[PDB]
Amino acid sequence: NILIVGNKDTYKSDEEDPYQVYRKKYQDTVFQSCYPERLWNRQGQPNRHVVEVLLKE
Amino acid sequence: NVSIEEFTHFDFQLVPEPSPLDLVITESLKNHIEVNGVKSGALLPLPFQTGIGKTYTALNFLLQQMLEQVRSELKEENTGKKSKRLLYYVTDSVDNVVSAKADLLKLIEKQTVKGEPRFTLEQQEYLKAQIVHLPNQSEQLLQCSDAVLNDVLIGFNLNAERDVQAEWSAISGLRRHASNPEVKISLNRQAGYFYRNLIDRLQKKQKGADRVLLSGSLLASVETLLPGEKIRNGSAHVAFLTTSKFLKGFHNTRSRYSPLRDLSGAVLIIDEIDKQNQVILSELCKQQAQDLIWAIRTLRANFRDHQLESSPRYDKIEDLFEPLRERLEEFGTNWNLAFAFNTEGANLNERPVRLFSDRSFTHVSSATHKLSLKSDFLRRKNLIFSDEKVEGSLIEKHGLLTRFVNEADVIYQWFLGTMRKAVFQYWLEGTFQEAVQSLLTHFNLQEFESAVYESFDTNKLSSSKSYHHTGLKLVEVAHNQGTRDTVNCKASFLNTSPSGVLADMVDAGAVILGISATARADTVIHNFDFKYLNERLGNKLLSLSREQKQRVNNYYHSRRNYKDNGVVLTVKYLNSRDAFLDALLEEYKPEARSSHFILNHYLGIAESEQAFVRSWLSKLLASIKAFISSPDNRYMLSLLNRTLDTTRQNINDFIQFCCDKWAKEFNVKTKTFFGVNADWMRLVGYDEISKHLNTELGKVVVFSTYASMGAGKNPDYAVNLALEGESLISVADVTYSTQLRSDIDSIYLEKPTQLLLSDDYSHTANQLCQFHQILSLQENGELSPKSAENWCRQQLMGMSRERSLQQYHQTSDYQSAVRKYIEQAVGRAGRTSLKRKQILLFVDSGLKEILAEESRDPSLFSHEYVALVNKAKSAGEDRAVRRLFNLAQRNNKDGMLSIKALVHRLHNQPASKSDIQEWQDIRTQLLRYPTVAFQPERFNRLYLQSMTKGYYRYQGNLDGDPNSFEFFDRVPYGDMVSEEDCSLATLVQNQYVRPWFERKGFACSWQKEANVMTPIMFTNIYKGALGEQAVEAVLTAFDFTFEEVPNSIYERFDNRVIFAGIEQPIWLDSKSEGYSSKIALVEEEFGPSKFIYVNALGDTSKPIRYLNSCFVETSPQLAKVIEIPALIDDSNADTNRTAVQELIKWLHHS
Amino acid sequence: DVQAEWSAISGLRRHASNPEVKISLNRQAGYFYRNLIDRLQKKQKGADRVLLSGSLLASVETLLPGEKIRNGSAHVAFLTTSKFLKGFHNTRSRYSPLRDLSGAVLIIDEIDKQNQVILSELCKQQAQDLIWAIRTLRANFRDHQLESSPRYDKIEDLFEPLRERLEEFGTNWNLAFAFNTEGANLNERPVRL
């Protein structure tokens, strides 16, 4: 699972954050997360290096 | 006071010895009368080089038209049918209008024939009175003296009114000391408003019975205050005004007069014709946005029962509005306009919703979702709710919000068009205001007054379809101001492009004489679409011929004989000079460390801009050094993109340092001129450079931009022979009116950068004219429909200005625009006949490849442009081919999306009569003309131009995405559209079909022509029509009678069939649960019936299949549908007589 | 446009000695003040609320003296009768003192003179065409209705008698047709009632 979640500080409580919720809910499930700004270049094209990094992680 | 009797003994046959340009204009307008007739309009583009007599030629033509009117009025005064033929001189800038009027008056005063004056003093006074100038209202007021307007106020008794005299006193008091600028803007604003109010007052004073009789001094003062009155009186018929004023119109005492509504018989000289494209576009972009929800609700509410007088003056007007009332009632019922509208669910406050649509295809919505439209009767609201659709699947099911907005736009524009038609039926232009007011007041629609006034001057597959006649619409859906529970759909429209406006002027009857050196540049961003104008005007678009072009070329050579006199044009292409720039920078700051540091610190260049600045600065400095080291060139002009004003002072000091260094090294003093702006030339006149070259010794560098050096600015200077040396020579074979002047002799040309139109003004905040560019490119074929739709999407989503430029760069329209800039630059710098013995042209090397591809006809090029092109080429992909590919895709996707809408409307019961008629028209056109020899007018988008005559291969999913169609030999192996692939030859060999086809006029074979039907037409319409006609052809001769399937279930079955002696209703379908659903739908309305499914072509040996209502096989007596597999044998076209006999045997068992 | 107008006003203000200059400056300043308050009320209406504090807050309170009254920082106002009847702006909207007179203490100098001033203010309302007004009311109230949500409770009941009266009026007087005079020359002299 890749969970495109918002920035961690902008969520005021742990249970509001999708991160730290499905992480404790699905205790036996591989997880990976990302922010949705972190897949654009400065011209807006998809950033392939990010998706290779996500896949290898 | 002078009268027309002064010309009684005037010799109208004596004319000055005409130039070849005058002869060319006269010959072209003679031929126009022969070909198109007397009352026809025309468009004559004249690619005349400015500086070789362009303005004199235009004004001499204008003067000849003035004398023709005098001769006609003297000769035909006894007829009484007076026609004061209007002549206009329009151009975009105020100063050019004023200058042209001044030059025409000067030409009247000083023209001579055979050494004798053309006109006497009284004749001169008569002609100069026929000419009028129409500025903006503020400047019109500030021209008039206090005596004139006091006379006007006294004569119209407005002097008694308190507010009128208060404002006039304030304006006068400002006018006494208006030297200050801020005083000037304030005075201009108040003068405009006061002129508006005052003219309103005389207009209401004049319309009624209290009409102040105007004569004598009051008439003169009024005509001075309102020059348009002289046109109404018939005392003047020549008007000098700008394009914006021409589009807006001018007042007289009676009303506002719009020249666009009265173009019949007018002659309209437009200077700088190709600049007027974007001027007209900016005038069209300024329309007031309007709310479609409010508009449709008001139209529906007021058209419900309000009606007109039923008097003789309202004949046939109610019938015009009758269809619109029915449509409004149906629309309000369907979309529940009793309720208001609101957004439900997804937050509209974080972002409103933007919808783009060209009214034909390429629809784009800013919402990622499928915004649908739901009527909640538990509440009383229409809710724009958001299904969670993703932005990527924009080709999904068509939502409801877009349909609602499109239909509302259609109804609104229909109302405006019906208003125009009703105004014409009510009535030639004083009736217009009264007609609009009476119609709007009878219907209680006075709130639409401004919309009708603003828009008045400005079944589709069967029509000539084009963007220029259609335009575009962008609608933003946002919360209403002050409320949080109601939504408005404010819409901004372009109903026509500037090319459409120009073609409308020509169709209305105007003879338009468009003069510009680049009048036929091959770009649609920076010029009118002449492909569209040639399609629409035909041969009313005049063109000077090859012999005429050769004569003009010879005349231009005789005035610019460089070669026989020894003038040489030297061209260099400069690239970056990094070492040269670095040495200069290290000389500028001797004790600094590195030249990169000098650039960063002392010049103030960020790390991002360093490479770009090093590129454009090195070329500029290399050109300047080569200019200074030259022995006798005296006048350089750099043309950059940026201005070198005080905002870039750190670079100006470095450039000044280098200039001083080279002036010392080569021992010639050079005076630079930084920041030659529009402002600089308004403040410090350009004659400062001229005076400097007239009095001082040495060289001169002038820094400017392409934008700064626009049309009408003359950079020539007065020659003082003591300073010039012997480097000036005269290149004209015959010289007259000596007045020694010369012009520029070195120039640097940077590559023009920001070429997409972008005004950045307030009115450009909606980005409408940024969609006009993508849609005009797609019209031309410069973009694939895929690229145009994607660019439209990114423009909706908010696009960087940089990225729009990159999208523009890959068209060949871009390169034609670049060459249009370069050709206009060197053209404006050549305005005299005294030249150096050498002229240097330094060019950015990024312009080399672009200029290498100039391949048009060089007969009318300027000498400098020829030199640039030849030098570019000497160091050495078709555009029409790429245009053919793109236009194949565009005509495909256009028909693909328009057939889908038409079928969806037919399946929406009831089927409207117009839709059925259009369906039949399309099928009849395709049956009669599968291919056409010339590009058709009325059905232009059923066809595509193929590279091979009569056939073409294509690849594309006919029910998938229309962006992914390819076409000619890009696809070697794929589907193929040809006469063979529809089996027309087998169909026409049959002895029953062929008489039917020859009787109906249908084509028995495909003509080998370039225009062939699009793949959507071939697969979805042509084959079905062929099958239906073949089946009807065979069965009608076996005693079947064929009549139309009615509107309740139209297009579900091709034809109702009636056999003689059988009374059970029969239905025909020609080529399971869906078919059973159709079965239930028909039998619900018409009871038990027989349905026939038959294929015209196939194997006749395969047996006939009998099915029930559920499409399950059964006995013939129990069957409800008969499935005839093959009516005509596919091998030899014999009739399947056994199958038809078995069918009629069943029909007897009914 | 804001910078252009403000700079023009400032340059006009730079000398402003001449009376007609003063008149022009007055009109321009009035219109520009109207536009500027319209805009800042827009940005304060939406979610993009500019937080006023310190120097900026004092600047707004100087430009909009009514903002001090809204903020609770000032509660004594000196203004003319005409301004009192018209109301004054704050950063949100226009505040009308007449709609919020509960608990107010109001000192009126030369009270009997204010009869004529109030009358002059009441005379200046805009006239309205009754035919157009009744036809618009009848046309729009025929089927248009409001949301039927808790924020619109008991409001449609307020309009129900008026809708019935509008339909009966339009039936009796035949408002499908427009109105015109017949016979005697209306243009010779209009009718006044």
Place this chain on the structure above:
Amino acid sequence: KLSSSKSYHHTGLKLVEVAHNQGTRDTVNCKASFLNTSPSGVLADMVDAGAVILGISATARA
């Protein structure tokens, strides 16, 4: 309205001017201008709305 307190000061007056519409010679408008209350009605409305009014003038009760 006879079952209510009747006074000019809170009924005011109406002046209607019937003329041809602007630009048309076949349609008439009814341009009405109203006074819905007198200044005394406005002053009494302020007092009824809860304002304490301190009217100072040497001729306050002329």
Place this chain on the structure above:
Amino acid sequence: ENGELSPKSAENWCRQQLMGMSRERSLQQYHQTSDYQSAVRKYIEQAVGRAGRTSLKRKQILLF
């Protein structure tokens, strides 16, 4: 409304006002009321009130 005019006089004055009326004739209509005299005394009472604004007075003040 005040009772200064009879309804007959008020309606005649309204009729003459509608048909155009000279200010001198409207003023003549007004002069017949006692409201006019109260207004006259109001004008006079303020004129001497606005001119009595200090406590230093002559031995003789002349009112003409």
Place this chain on the structure above:
DNA sequence: TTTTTTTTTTT
């Protein structure tokens, strides 16, 4: 017949 000069504010 009676017999004038004053004013504010938004647009």
Place this chain on the structure above:
DNA sequence: GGAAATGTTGAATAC
């Protein structure tokens, strides 16, 4: 919460 690996600011220390 792209990763690792490099790198700099601010803060506490603090001699």
Place this chain on the structure above:
DNA sequence: GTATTCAACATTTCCTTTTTTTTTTTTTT
């Protein structure tokens, strides 16, 4: 108005351009 040590988040790269790089106008309201 200190100097030195050090722990915490920024930044660039990545199966290698972010892309192109501006000034200019008329008219009514």
